[PDB]
Symmetry: C4
């Protein structure tokens, strides 16, 4: 469950990292940063400069946001909550 979402998220981020480092010519870490802030809806820096980068970002957002938030949702409810919930027991 959490494992599946984790793998799917990693694969999605790797895909984004490869795309932006290639098409937008970003250093890998910046490409990964862009992929992460975009899919978590935090932001979009550096904004794509090529039409290909803009088109891909549009599609990337619509397809990846759902996955990313599903992962964060389960990561917090099925992994972060129990660790604090149980740890709150005297």
């Amino acid at each position: 469950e959490f494992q599946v979402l984790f793998v799917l998220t990693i694969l999605t981020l790797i895909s984004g990292t490869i795309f932006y480092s290639t098409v937008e010519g970003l250093r890998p870490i910046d490409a990964l940063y862009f992929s992460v802030v975009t899919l978590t809806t935090v932001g979009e820096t550096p904004t794509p400069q090529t039409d290909f980068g803009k088109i891909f970002t549009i599609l990337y957002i619509f397809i990846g946001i759902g996955l990313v938030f599903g992962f964060i949702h389960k990561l917090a409810v099925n992994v972060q909550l129990p660790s604090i919930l149980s740890n709150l027991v005297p």
Copy 2:
């Protein structure tokens, strides 16, 4: 269901694209990019320069965010989940 939300989203994005390319004078792809990152709450680049663009963006956000996330929600739960859920069956 998913089809309806898809059509409504496309129409909303087209409307945004037409507005920003006209009033803010953006190239269509940039107008579409702005419309997408705004409604998905990712960001807002390039920020509108005219008061008309700012007013429209305010109204655009309040009316479109709900629709856009409904689409992403169903796109992920009623289309992305089944494809992975069923595909996870040996």
Copy 3:
């Protein structure tokens, strides 16, 4: 219900507009734009330049996001959905 959330949202946005136009010295429309993109989590332009503006924004976000999304949620489910739901009936 929807009316209450609407009034609360308007009051919250007016408060933000007054604050930023005064402390950050922004033109009212820009102060309102900032208040809207911040509470909808879309963005934050122009970023506050004074420590007072930064502190207020921090508190503004935590107190207003919940309200704003409650309004958008009901605006879409109890107002946008019915109009399309019923209109989808031959």
Copy 4:
């Protein structure tokens, strides 16, 4: 309940504030501002300039967003709603 989420959020923000003021060399208030807009998904200003800042931000986002929104969710439903719900009684 609300108290626990409040404490966890404060601790998370303090951690972010310390990190960015140290590694990114930001004034504390700017480090706190960055930590807040990032975890609430509002934005990311100023964008990290060091690879360490970018890596930390990526991890910070995934681990903190869930917590932050849980707090805002309860702050609005279990604290803001009752105050308006009960206050709406003649």
